[PDB]
Amino acid sequence: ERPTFYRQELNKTIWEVPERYQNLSPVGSGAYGSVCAAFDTKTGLRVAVKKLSRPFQSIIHAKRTYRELRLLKHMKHENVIGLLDVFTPARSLEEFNDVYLVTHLMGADLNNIVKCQKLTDDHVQFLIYQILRGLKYIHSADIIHRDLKPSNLAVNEDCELKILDFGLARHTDDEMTGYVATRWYRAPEIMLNWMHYNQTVDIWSVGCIMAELLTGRTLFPGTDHIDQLKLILRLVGTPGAELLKKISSESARNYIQSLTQMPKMNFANVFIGANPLAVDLLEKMLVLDSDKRITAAQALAHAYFAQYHDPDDEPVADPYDQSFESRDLLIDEWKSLTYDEVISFVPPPL
């Protein structure tokens, strides 16, 4: 039974939503993308409604739309954004072009918190703890996120954190899409081992995010790929002989060998006056060699989080099963698969 919809132009975009969702208001004046705060009169909840941007604009984006909806429907964890509702104004597959997702309103993202002049170390402890708690869960499902960054972490007024945006997430595999992550948070093996990174790229991003929380500044704000690589090497040091041999790009190896030799910095001399345990965790997160990087599960046991760590309150997931995602499909197949997932969504009990 299709609800009554109504239509409204919001910042040069036509939103069409069920009448239960009232007083749509773009968060931050529309600077955070296509997300509106609303009041759900059916539940009395304050919700955030995301209108997916151009979900079927290409084969790649259609695929990403399907993966994100499937993952969001599969996952159930306090530090991962959860679906209250999923809808489309379309009355049939034939006119299906728009997807809307609904969750609890959170009210800020980590970019706001980075600017907070009253941020304490305990706050950093609690925020990074929750990112890692969500990441332990995600990785245990054999999901890889691939786009962690401050704007993809929502924080509510109780400093409860949820990972947003699974648009680039997928089931992990030996070979995956090459150009992923946002540049300032992109792990170096994404550039050095084209299409053959693994879940530790997400730990790199968390390291970059923690550093930004501690200092108030982007850790590696590169303006291009060469710039980005050099900014990283200035901190973690240029690779030695045994590590070069794991770099699959001969052009990258050749370029790196042309640079001045750089040692690993003492992070205690970068993050001045930070908790020594925070510096220690950062040293274990921001390591060039992917195989020596700390895991999410290991990081939750780090002494930095002793106030919050509870090994029986850090659950793992049921592993995610990749239904139709292993082949190259046309947009119309991705649309039909996504339509079926919209029509079959069952809202959680209140």
Binding site: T177, G178, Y179, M191, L192, W194, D224, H225, I226, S249, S251, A252, N254, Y255, S258
Partner: peptide
């Protein structure tokens, strides 16, 4: 799909 990183690396050396 093309690798944009190798392009920049080969140029930076050149």
């Amino acid at each position: 799909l093309a690798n944009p990183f190798e392009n920049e690396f080969k140029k930076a050396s050149e």
